[PDB]
Amino acid sequence: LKDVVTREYTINLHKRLHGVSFKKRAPRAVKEIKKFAKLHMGTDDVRLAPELNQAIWKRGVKGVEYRLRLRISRKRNEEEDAKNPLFSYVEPVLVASAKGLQTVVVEED
Amino acid sequence: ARYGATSTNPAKSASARGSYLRVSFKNTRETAQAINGWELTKAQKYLEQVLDHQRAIPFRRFNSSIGRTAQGKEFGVTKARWPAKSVKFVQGLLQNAAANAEAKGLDATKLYVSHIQVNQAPKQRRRTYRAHGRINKYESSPSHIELVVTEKEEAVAKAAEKKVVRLTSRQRGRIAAQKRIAA
Amino acid sequence: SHRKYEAPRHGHLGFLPRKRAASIRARVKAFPKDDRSKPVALTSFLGYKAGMTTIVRDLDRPGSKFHKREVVEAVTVVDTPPVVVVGVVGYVETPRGLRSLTTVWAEHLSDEVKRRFYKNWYKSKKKAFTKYSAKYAQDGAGIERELARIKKYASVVRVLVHTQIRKTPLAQKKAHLAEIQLNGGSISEKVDWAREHFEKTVAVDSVFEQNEMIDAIAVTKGHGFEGVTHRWGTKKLPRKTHRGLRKVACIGAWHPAHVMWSVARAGQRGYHSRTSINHKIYRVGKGDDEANGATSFDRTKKTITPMGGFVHYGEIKNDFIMVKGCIPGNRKRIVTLRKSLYTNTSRKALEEVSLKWIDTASKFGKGRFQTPAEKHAFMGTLKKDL
Amino acid sequence: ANLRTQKRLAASVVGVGKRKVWLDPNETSEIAQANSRNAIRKLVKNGTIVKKAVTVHSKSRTR
RNA sequence: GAAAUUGUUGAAAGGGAAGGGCAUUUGAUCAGACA
RNA sequence: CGUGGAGGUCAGUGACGAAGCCUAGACCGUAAGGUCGGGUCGAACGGCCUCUAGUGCAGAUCUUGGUGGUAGUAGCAAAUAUUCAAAUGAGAACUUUGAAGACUGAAGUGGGGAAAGGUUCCACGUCAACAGCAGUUGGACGUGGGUUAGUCGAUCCUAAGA
RNA sequence: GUGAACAGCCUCUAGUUGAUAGAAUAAUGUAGAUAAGGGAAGUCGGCAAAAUAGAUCCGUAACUUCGGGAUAAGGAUUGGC
Ligand SMILES: [Mg+2]
Ligand SMILES: [Mg+2]
Ligand SMILES: [Mg+2]
Ligand SMILES: [Mg+2]
Ligand SMILES: [Mg+2]
Ligand SMILES: [Mg+2]
Ligand SMILES: [Mg+2]
Ligand SMILES: [Mg+2]
Ligand SMILES: [Mg+2]
Ligand SMILES: [Mg+2]
Ligand SMILES: [Mg+2]
Ligand SMILES: [Mg+2]
Ligand SMILES: [Mg+2]
Ligand SMILES: [Mg+2]
Ligand SMILES: [Mg+2]
Ligand SMILES: [Mg+2]
Ligand SMILES: [Mg+2]
Ligand SMILES: [Mg+2]
Ligand SMILES: [Mg+2]
Ligand SMILES: [Mg+2]
Ligand SMILES: [Mg+2]
Ligand SMILES: [Mg+2]
Ligand SMILES: [Mg+2]
Ligand SMILES: [Mg+2]
Ligand SMILES: [Mg+2]
Ligand SMILES: [Mg+2]
Ligand SMILES: [Mg+2]
Ligand SMILES: [Mg+2]
Ligand SMILES: [Mg+2]
Ligand SMILES: [Mg+2]
Ligand SMILES: [Mg+2]
Ligand SMILES: [Mg+2]
Ligand SMILES: [Mg+2]
Ligand SMILES: [Mg+2]
Ligand SMILES: [Mg+2]
Ligand SMILES: [Mg+2]
Ligand SMILES: [Mg+2]
Ligand SMILES: [Mg+2]
Ligand SMILES: [Mg+2]
Ligand SMILES: [Mg+2]
Ligand SMILES: [Mg+2]
Ligand SMILES: [Mg+2]
Ligand SMILES: [Mg+2]
Ligand SMILES: [Mg+2]
Ligand SMILES: [Mg+2]
Ligand SMILES: [Mg+2]
Ligand SMILES: [Mg+2]
Ligand SMILES: [Mg+2]
Ligand SMILES: [Mg+2]
Ligand SMILES: [Mg+2]
Ligand SMILES: [Mg+2]
Ligand SMILES: [Mg+2]
Ligand SMILES: [Mg+2]
Ligand SMILES: [Mg+2]
Ligand SMILES: [Mg+2]
Ligand SMILES: [Mg+2]
Ligand SMILES: [Mg+2]
Ligand SMILES: [Mg+2]
Ligand SMILES: [Mg+2]
Ligand SMILES: [Mg+2]
Ligand SMILES: [Mg+2]
Ligand SMILES: [Mg+2]
Ligand SMILES: [Mg+2]
Ligand SMILES: [Mg+2]
Ligand SMILES: [Mg+2]
Ligand SMILES: [Mg+2]
Ligand SMILES: [Mg+2]
Ligand SMILES: [Mg+2]
Ligand SMILES: [Mg+2]
Ligand SMILES: [Mg+2]
Ligand SMILES: [Mg+2]
Ligand SMILES: [Mg+2]
Ligand SMILES: [Mg+2]
Ligand SMILES: [Mg+2]
């Protein structure tokens, strides 16, 4: 079936970005994250909160933080019906340190 | 009309053209033949996958110095590509043909693609500037695409000549005597 | 005209073509000459290269400036858990050469080997050998006559063994299977040995001893498409030269008007098969043995596994072969270790080593401590700890 | 939809370079209608177009 | 609405060119003459 | 032998299909060539005796046009750099808007002029071509609007010179 | 702002964010760097590259048209508070 979940994840950008040419780091990150969502949610359709976008670019192109604490929300799709009924919205969580958290499920209401 | 050579019951067929289209003649040749003869429905699913880089189009003539890909294994082939603009145009006509078959009242379930032919439309000349004050042709090489779908039909029954046998005097002597002797 | 100055060519034509090998598992192109007086055993063994460490030992070489002085020497370690016997195969002599005439297989077969017979295990119905297994049912009839046949003919006999890769830190699950010639005496004694060991399990110590010179057959590390200058160690061309300098200036005279097989050209490098000889066994380790990497002289209990573990490999929890120096292939590669094809007198071979100390500090950095115990000793107490 | 002209107009009306006019995305249909300077002027008056602040270059570390 | 040159269909052949000459097999195809 | 045109002639052929073109179908000639069938076509045309010449092509780095192999190949890599979302639209990597990340760094990627262009300005509509990907965008395409002086220039004066 | 400075480097105002795009990072390249010990043995030739550099002080040869040569050469110094 579907499922509709929200969880909160920490992604290791650092090794995903290891090596990447400086002018492509913040961009690879965007993409690398999108990938991270489909891997966990199964979902091709992955959208990024403009806030999350800001969190990524917060230090310039090549200054992407080593760990981000995402919140990924699998949601049903609407209007002109895309290929799949499901998509994912990713958003930044407002955490003090992103270091040290395992992955949790967010209770839905 | 007046399409290319066909051999097919027009009462059980439908057709579509595109002419003067601005797609690479060479690439859409290659993609037209990937489709050629396929079950209409199998073909539409197939181009869709092409577009997804999940199956590929086997490049068989217009193909020197082309990439190699595992996605040609299926077709016995190492060189294969995913020529998007072609596909989208070719399925554009496939779509049209379907509609025409629907309109004719042909059974969609039996539709195979029986004729698909591309050849060369008039070229379109732009131009480019080469070193030392020279100019060079820069040319669009566009296509005419044409296809024909048909309802698949079984059998063929038999019927032919009867072979008029001719044999000499000594030849129907063996024969005559063969039964007079044996069975 | 004529060279001008003479120089040896660049590199060895005896290793051509310099293409990628047909398999990861280099082939034993020859086995030790058979002496049918000795008891039966293998003549090779499968293993995986773990890595290298350093050794300190005294030298016994009367005449050398370093006679009776310590030397330090590099050694490699290959992970060597018991191979398991799953079949025999008998060859016969023909005027067209040696041909295989039957392969007899053991009734049960580990998933490890069974896995080798496949490219898509998870989806597959695992039907391999499931009819063959049935040949045991009827009293034994069919298997015997094969065995029986082997004995009657068969000029040589090789055993089908495979590795217990699960006893190994590798991911790769798919075990390695291979023919090992069987030199202990008498064709008939040979297959009896083989038949007997079916599904049973064979150990390294039953094949190799300390100080023995062995050979190592393996597929070399790969480097991909490679320019002429490093692939052949051609001279760099001068700095002034148009369109590149890691090249060869003259790829040939004008006649033969043909580039020739004997000149250096860019291409694949590495992933070549190599048969390397005269590596000496400095240690035959035993898995079930703390103080693996301890010594007569060291004492201090510890295995050969470096702190933090063999970089890029893992841990070593099985018997192992310690061989002095370096060896074809890289860490994690399947390697065949082979009995030498001649009895070397050498002096160099014959020397009966005995380690004093086996390094065990981390290879992941400039390691300073053999053991956590040592490190804890020297550092004092830290903010974590008790 | 295409608010370039209203952007430029915005700049000129307010006395500020275009790098500082703000056209809010949520009143996009209303803004487009604004073809004139009198129209932009009303739009500026009621906050559909705002001036956007200067970017600080503080003399504090100089001082 | 020729030709170069092209797509499709049908038939054939092809172990580092192809095309040609004498001759016949084999396939395809056809005129004439019998009365 | 074959072509274009001319005199004579066969009361020649033809819209019930002239000419032309196509055709590993037929027949005559050693050959130049000639004749027929079928297909395509659509308004003219040929046999014979003579007359006549801008009369016969494989070449001339021949002329003009058209066309290939090369080849979906060389390539589309200078000028630091882009990103998230919304809106619109058949269609959005590229349009609009918001956000963010940067750049030019007042010796400017700012604000104006001279020469030169001549409508490129501006609005609306809008994508067939063009902008060596794209395109819903444009200095493109369509249709309109727009350049206000006693004081700013010219106009007057003189320069080399004409 | 730094600084001798209309230099270079960073910023405000203004203006841009145009330059086909995606994925990989083989050989060979173009452009940017580093390399133990030796130090021109390389090469037609030190070509290329490296070294030097600002300021304050000290010190400064031959020779000369007495003006120079001269930043000769050679040295020390330099932050923050
Ligand atoms: Mg790197
Ligand atoms: Mg047409
Ligand atoms: Mg071709
Ligand atoms: Mg071709
Ligand atoms: Mg290429
Ligand atoms: Mg080629
Ligand atoms: Mg290629
Ligand atoms: Mg892939
Ligand atoms: Mg192929
Ligand atoms: Mg050019
Ligand atoms: Mg020019
Ligand atoms: Mg008879
Ligand atoms: Mg010589
Ligand atoms: Mg192979
Ligand atoms: Mg047999
Ligand atoms: Mg290299
Ligand atoms: Mg060398
Ligand atoms: Mg080497
Ligand atoms: Mg040069
Ligand atoms: Mg060389
Ligand atoms: Mg016409
Ligand atoms: Mg044929
Ligand atoms: Mg013949
Ligand atoms: Mg004549
Ligand atoms: Mg004439
Ligand atoms: Mg004439
Ligand atoms: Mg022909
Ligand atoms: Mg005839
Ligand atoms: Mg006719
Ligand atoms: Mg006619
Ligand atoms: Mg007419
Ligand atoms: Mg005449
Ligand atoms: Mg002439
Ligand atoms: Mg001629
Ligand atoms: Mg000609
Ligand atoms: Mg000639
Ligand atoms: Mg010519
Ligand atoms: Mg031409
Ligand atoms: Mg193309
Ligand atoms: Mg290319
Ligand atoms: Mg280039
Ligand atoms: Mg750029
Ligand atoms: Mg862009
Ligand atoms: Mg934007
Ligand atoms: Mg700057
Ligand atoms: Mg400046
Ligand atoms: Mg510009
Ligand atoms: Mg102006
Ligand atoms: Mg102009
Ligand atoms: Mg106008
Ligand atoms: Mg305009
Ligand atoms: Mg268009
Ligand atoms: Mg233009
Ligand atoms: Mg374009
Ligand atoms: Mg276009
Ligand atoms: Mg206009
Ligand atoms: Mg005045
Ligand atoms: Mg006046
Ligand atoms: Mg401007
Ligand atoms: Mg460009
Ligand atoms: Mg690119
Ligand atoms: Mg890699
Ligand atoms: Mg050095
Ligand atoms: Mg020195
Ligand atoms: Mg010298
Ligand atoms: Mg010297
Ligand atoms: Mg020399
Ligand atoms: Mg010289
Ligand atoms: Mg010299
Ligand atoms: Mg120099
Ligand atoms: Mg240095
Ligand atoms: Mg001087
Ligand atoms: Mg001097
Ligand atoms: Mg001080």
From Swiss-Prot, chain A:
Any one annotated GO CC term: cytosol
GO BP term (any one): regulation of translational fidelity
Disulfide topology: none
Record localization: Cytoplasm
InterPro entries documented for this protein: Ribosomal_eL31, Ribosomal_eL31_CS, Ribosomal_eL31_dom_sf
Keyword annotations: Cytoplasm, Ribonucleoprotein, Ribosomal protein
SUPFAM superfamilies membership: Ribosomal protein L31e
Pfam families reported for this sequence: Ribosomal_L31e
One GO MF term: structural constituent of ribosome
Quaternary state and interactors: Component of the large ribosomal subunit (LSU). Mature yeast ribosomes consist of a small (40S) and a large (60S) subunit. The 40S small subunit contains 1 molecule of ribosomal RNA (18S rRNA) and 33 different proteins (encoded by 57 genes). The large 60S subunit contains 3 rRNA molecules (25S, 5.8S and 5S rRNA) and 46 different proteins (encoded by 81 genes).
Protein purpose: Component of the ribosome, a large ribonucleoprotein complex responsible for the synthesis of proteins in the cell. The small ribosomal subunit (SSU) binds messenger RNAs (mRNAs) and translates the encoded message by selecting cognate aminoacyl-transfer RNA (tRNA) molecules. The large subunit (LSU) contains the ribosomal catalytic site termed the peptidyl transferase center (PTC), which catalyzes the formation of peptide bonds, thereby polymerizing the amino acids delivered by tRNAs into a polypeptide chain.
Note: There are 2 genes for eL31 in yeast.
Family that this chain belongs to: Belongs to the eukaryotic ribosomal protein eL31 family.
Protein name per UniProt: Large ribosomal subunit protein eL31A
UniProtKB/Swiss-Prot annotation, chain B:
Name by which UniProt lists this protein: Large ribosomal subunit protein uL22A
Compartment(s) where it occurs, according to its Swiss-Prot or TrEMBL record: Cytoplasm
Role noted for this protein: Component of the ribosome, a large ribonucleoprotein complex responsible for the synthesis of proteins in the cell. The small ribosomal subunit (SSU) binds messenger RNAs (mRNAs) and translates the encoded message by selecting cognate aminoacyl-transfer RNA (tRNA) molecules. The large subunit (LSU) contains the ribosomal catalytic site termed the peptidyl transferase center (PTC), which catalyzes the formation of peptide bonds, thereby polymerizing the amino acids delivered by tRNAs into a polypeptide chain.
GO molecular function annotation: structural constituent of ribosome
Keyword check for Ribosomal protein: yes
Gene3D superfamilies: Ribosomal protein L22/L17 (3.90.470.10)
SUBUNIT field: Component of the large ribosomal subunit (LSU). Mature yeast ribosomes consist of a small (40S) and a large (60S) subunit. The 40S small subunit contains 1 molecule of ribosomal RNA (18S rRNA) and 33 different proteins (encoded by 57 genes). The large 60S subunit contains 3 rRNA molecules (25S, 5.8S and 5S rRNA) and 46 different proteins (encoded by 81 genes). uL22 is associated with the polypeptide exit tunnel.
Family: Belongs to the universal ribosomal protein uL22 family.
Matching CDD domains: Ribosomal_L22 (cd00336)
Keywords: Cytoplasm, Isopeptide bond, Phosphoprotein, Ribonucleoprotein, Ribosomal protein, Ubl conjugation
From Swiss-Prot, chain C:
High-level lineage: Eukaryota, Fungi, Dikarya, Ascomycota, Saccharomycotina
Post-translational modification summary for this protein: Methylation at His-242 by HPM1 is required for proper 60S subunit assembly and promotes translational elongation fidelity.
UniProt-reported outcome of changing H242A: Cells accumulate 35S and 23S pre-rRNA precursors. Cells display defects in translation elongation resulting in decreased translational accuracy
GO MF, one example: structural constituent of ribosome
Post-translational modification Pros-methylhistidine, affected residues: H242
Protein name: Large ribosomal subunit protein uL3
Covalent cross-link (Glycyl lysine isopeptide (Lys-Gly) (interchain with G-Cter in ubiquitin)), residues: K38, K135
Subunit comment: Component of the large ribosomal subunit (LSU). Mature yeast ribosomes consist of a small (40S) and a large (60S) subunit. The 40S small subunit contains 1 molecule of ribosomal RNA (18S rRNA) and 33 different proteins (encoded by 57 genes). The large 60S subunit contains 3 rRNA molecules (25S, 5.8S and 5S rRNA) and 46 different proteins (encoded by 81 genes). uL3 forms together with ES39L one of the contact sites for the signal recognition particle that targets ribosomes to the endoplasmic reticulum membrane.
Organism, scientific name: Saccharomyces cerevisiae (strain ATCC 204508 / S288c)
Changes seen on gene knockout: A mutant confers resistance to trichodermin, a trichotecene toxin produced by plant-pathogenic fungi.
PROSITE patterns the record matches: RIBOSOMAL_L3
Curated annotation (Swiss-Prot), chain D:
Entry keyword annotation includes ATP-binding: no
Biased composition (Basic residues): 58-63
Residue positions, PTM Phosphoserine: S29, S36
GO biological process: cytoplasmic translation
Record localization: Cytoplasm
GO cellular component, one term: cytosol
Residue runs in coiled coils: none
Keywords per UniProt: Cytoplasm, Isopeptide bond, Phosphoprotein, Ribonucleoprotein, Ribosomal protein, Ubl conjugation
Cross-link Glycyl lysine isopeptide (Lys-Gly) (interchain with G-Cter in ubiquitin): residue positions: K20, K52, K59
GO molecular function, one term: RNA binding
Comment field (misc): Present with 97700 molecules/cell in log phase SD medium. There are 2 genes for eL19 in yeast.
Family statement: Belongs to the eukaryotic ribosomal protein eL19 family.
Role according to the record: Component of the ribosome, a large ribonucleoprotein complex responsible for the synthesis of proteins in the cell. The small ribosomal subunit (SSU) binds messenger RNAs (mRNAs) and translates the encoded message by selecting cognate aminoacyl-transfer RNA (tRNA) molecules. The large subunit (LSU) contains the ribosomal catalytic site termed the peptidyl transferase center (PTC), which catalyzes the formation of peptide bonds, thereby polymerizing the amino acids delivered by tRNAs into a polypeptide chain.
Protein name according to UniProt: Large ribosomal subunit protein eL19A
Provenance organism: Saccharomyces cerevisiae (strain ATCC 204508 / S288c)
Name of the coding gene: RPL19A
Parent-protein residues present: 2 to 64 of 189
